[PDB]
Amino acid sequence: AEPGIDKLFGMVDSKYRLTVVVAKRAQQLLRHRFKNTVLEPEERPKMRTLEGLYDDPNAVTWAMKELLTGRLFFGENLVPEDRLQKEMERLY
């Protein structure tokens, strides 16, 4: 399963609304700007293979953990879908 997946259902009123948030975030968490993660300290999701410790290229996992730090927000908010580019603009 997923580390604390059941805890993800409790928050979202629907199991389907959760998925959307998971990806919606991953879209602007690694692809948009890898420096948009709230989890930066020692809570930063990392892998440990033969080489060493590095951040997993997959961001879908970060969302599940990112939507557990109590931060972020979901639901009908900010009608301008073109404003997301403005906020992302400040993040280079």
């Binding site: 199991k15 389907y16 998925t19 879209q27 690694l30 692809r31």
Partner: protein, 1084 residues
Amino acid sequence: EIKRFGRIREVIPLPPLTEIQVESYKKALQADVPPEKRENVGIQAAFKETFPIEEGLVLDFLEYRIGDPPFSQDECREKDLTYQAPLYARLQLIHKDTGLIKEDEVFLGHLPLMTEDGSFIINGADRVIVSQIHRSPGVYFTPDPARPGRYIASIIPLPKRGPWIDLEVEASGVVTMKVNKRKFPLVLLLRVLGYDQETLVRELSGLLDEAVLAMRPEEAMVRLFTLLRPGLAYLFGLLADPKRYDLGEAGRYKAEEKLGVGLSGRTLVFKDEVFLPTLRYLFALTAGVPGHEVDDIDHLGNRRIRTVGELMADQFRVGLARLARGVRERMVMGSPDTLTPAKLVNSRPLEAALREFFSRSQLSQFKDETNPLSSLRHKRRISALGPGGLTRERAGFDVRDVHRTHYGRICPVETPEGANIGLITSLAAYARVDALGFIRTPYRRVKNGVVTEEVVYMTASEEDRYTIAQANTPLEGDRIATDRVVARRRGEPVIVAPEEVEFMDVSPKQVFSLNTNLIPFLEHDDANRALMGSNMQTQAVPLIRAQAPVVMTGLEERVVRDSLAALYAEEDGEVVKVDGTRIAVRYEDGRLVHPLRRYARSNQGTAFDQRPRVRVGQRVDLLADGPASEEGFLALGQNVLVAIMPFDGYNFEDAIVISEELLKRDFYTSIHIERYEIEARDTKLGPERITRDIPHLSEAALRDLDEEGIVRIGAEVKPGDILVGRTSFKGEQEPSPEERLLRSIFGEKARDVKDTSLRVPPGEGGIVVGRLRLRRGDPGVELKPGVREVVRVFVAQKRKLQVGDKLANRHGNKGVVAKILPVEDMPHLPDGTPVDVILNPLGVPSRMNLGQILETHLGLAGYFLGQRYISPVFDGATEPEIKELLAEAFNLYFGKRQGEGFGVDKREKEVLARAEKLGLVSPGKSPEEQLKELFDLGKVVLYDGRTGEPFEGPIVVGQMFIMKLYHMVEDKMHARSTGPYSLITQQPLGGKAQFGGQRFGEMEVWALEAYGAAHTLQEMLTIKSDDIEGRNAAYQAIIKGEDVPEPSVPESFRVLVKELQALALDVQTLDEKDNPVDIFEGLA
């Protein structure tokens, strides 16, 4: 090692087993027989049936000639041509004034014959046909399934040879006559029979209720022709073509023993024939003494097995039919120009139409040459599907009670599979003899030296199955009898007489098929269970090893010679064999060298070999084995020590465990071959030619193993390499703009032929055995017009044994190789010999119970005692028989230990504490005996090489039989990306490099959408597959950067809108605004 367990082996099994084929080209094909004699049946049969073609001008048919075929054997399995021998008869048109123009045997055309092997060679594919079955002619009436009203359903001579006659009795116009497709009163036509009144009523018999239809002869002919067809009689019994129960049996010998005395062969010839005896046996049938209302009931006594002999006789006729029609047209036009019995007859209609039958007709399935037993199961396979109306798989009106079992012990009950049950079975070993040409005939012993063949319909003084005998007069007192259905206790005439007219089965092999009797202990499993195992012997993929299964019936003694898998020895002996690839000669009569098949070639990619076994001189009469055999002993799979037990889970459900021991000795290994073919087309625009200097392909990988074009023989090649680099001037894509740069930048120039080569397919890591250049300029090669240079190479490859594959012995227990742990682990016997294979239960043991374990117990027993027992089906080899054997095996086993310098082990002592309370071994003397009885019905303690401590509990061990099916893993796997494509179809299919493919079952999409998957579901039709212009988006994106795929643009939908646009229908992309009426299709 001969431990025969067979009792009273009277007459041997009906040889040569393959008699259906012999009685096919010896009963019908009266070629190798002087025209002076011979009746019909076959050529001369359908030949004479062809009435003297009218127009004097009348062509007469006489004599015939076959033999001296163009290309002999091997020359066909290499060039493709078939073994079609020329056949032609002597003709001579005749007309009023002197017109006895007889041609020189009138060279007609070709005709494929049969080989001693018992098969045919079609397009170098050497295929075989399968005789069908159908209710023989005659009146069976058939009980009305709907409402109580026994009607009539007269069976025609052949499905495709006559209007089906019938007689139903309803309300409106009771007793209505209907043949082929008619709806008229029986009286209306009964009149035409010369009988209208006074002679048909009271004399023999709602009948003449229509007196107005039984008065005038001619009128009946006019009224009838008005009821059938729109607003005919020339057939239906009249003349020989639509209705004619010729031959002399089946159709003929029926009413003579059913309806009444008297018969000409065909109904209503208009003199009635079957229209009188019918109502005579009908009116007397309804509420009468003479019952016999016995319907078809799948009674084999009525089931006709039309062999190939008559199977071709009809098709041949049908083909010869056009010839007669063609001659007529030739007689209607012209007179002096060109009219000779050789010009009016062309070798195209009676040929092409006769050849398309062996190349395309279902029955002519690709001769399964996987193994000897597979090729022999075709001539006996038999079916009901084909040109007849007993086809249609899955459904077909009402066939539920048509494929089910039947009271016919002349056919097995475990040959079918699934998709087609009852339609595909097999013939018995002691079946098909004497005049099998008509109806089947089994064997019956009279308790005295003699065997009669009174057909299957036998019912004289019941009978008894081979069970308990005592010098002709079994002192049983209760002779197990079996008459018709149930078996009334017994009979025992209580006399020194022969028997109960036929109370003797001779051998228990008469029940099951010669394929099922092979099974060792065939008497401890279910039908379905034994079914799968029986089919495993059809794809057991031969092996050079062939250790031969310990327990094997003495029936395989003929499966090696009859199948001609191996060779033979004529007359005397004195071999002085030189061996190698060409067996020497024998001092019997002359000097004839026996050349091996040289690995030959298989139709399933197996390639069988035949290693000899002799030197200096010897005779008796085996001589060199075959594919999967050993000393005249049929050895399909391979027997190896196994042990039933679970191991970490590497055998869940019904999986199988394998050790590295097998691989170290390459115990389980096979061979797979594949023929390639690269034709050099001539599109005129640019002819193709094979060269060794392919453009842009300028590299070493070529000149090294290519040269002159074709690859060198005996050169190991892997996938992704060249084999037949042909050059084509075909210029489809001219030079591209910015491409002209990268072409000039380097040291090379342009091109005008492109690479375009063969390129090894996704799987081929072996070596080439030999090539073959077959280009034009040679009149001895029938190739496609306009084609030049037809390269044909043979690539081999060793199989070894990876992971997976199906074992499945000879009982049903099938599985798959999970993991092959190298020696180290695996249960180590208390004397070495680590368990090579582990067979944990689950799957078939408890559920679909069977009897394979009875082999294990007698396996290790024959290992130590050094013997290979023989267990005949339904005879000998029982639980108590294992007791006596186990005793000797134990003392011999423990004997070594007890004398080696030890005896009884601690770890071997605690295990007894188990059985003790477990109720297994009885408490008493020292562990010596406790370990003895534990061996009789079980095995030694056994340990575990991985963990460290022995498996607490009595585990069984012994040698059984571990086979290997054709289905593997390598050639059963696939993988691809965007590489695949099939323009016009808008889906991944085809490819000159990769023939990838994958389907998304309909029952799969619904499940995918059942979840929250909406983007993943759409994706399956977003970028990939559908959207061709979208397939790039994704694949082009990821390769460049992240980014999210397109919104989706269906491709087939555009084709659907188009295909559906072929008509008025206007699939408009109505937008949510309505008035705008959005439309996406304008080339964007």
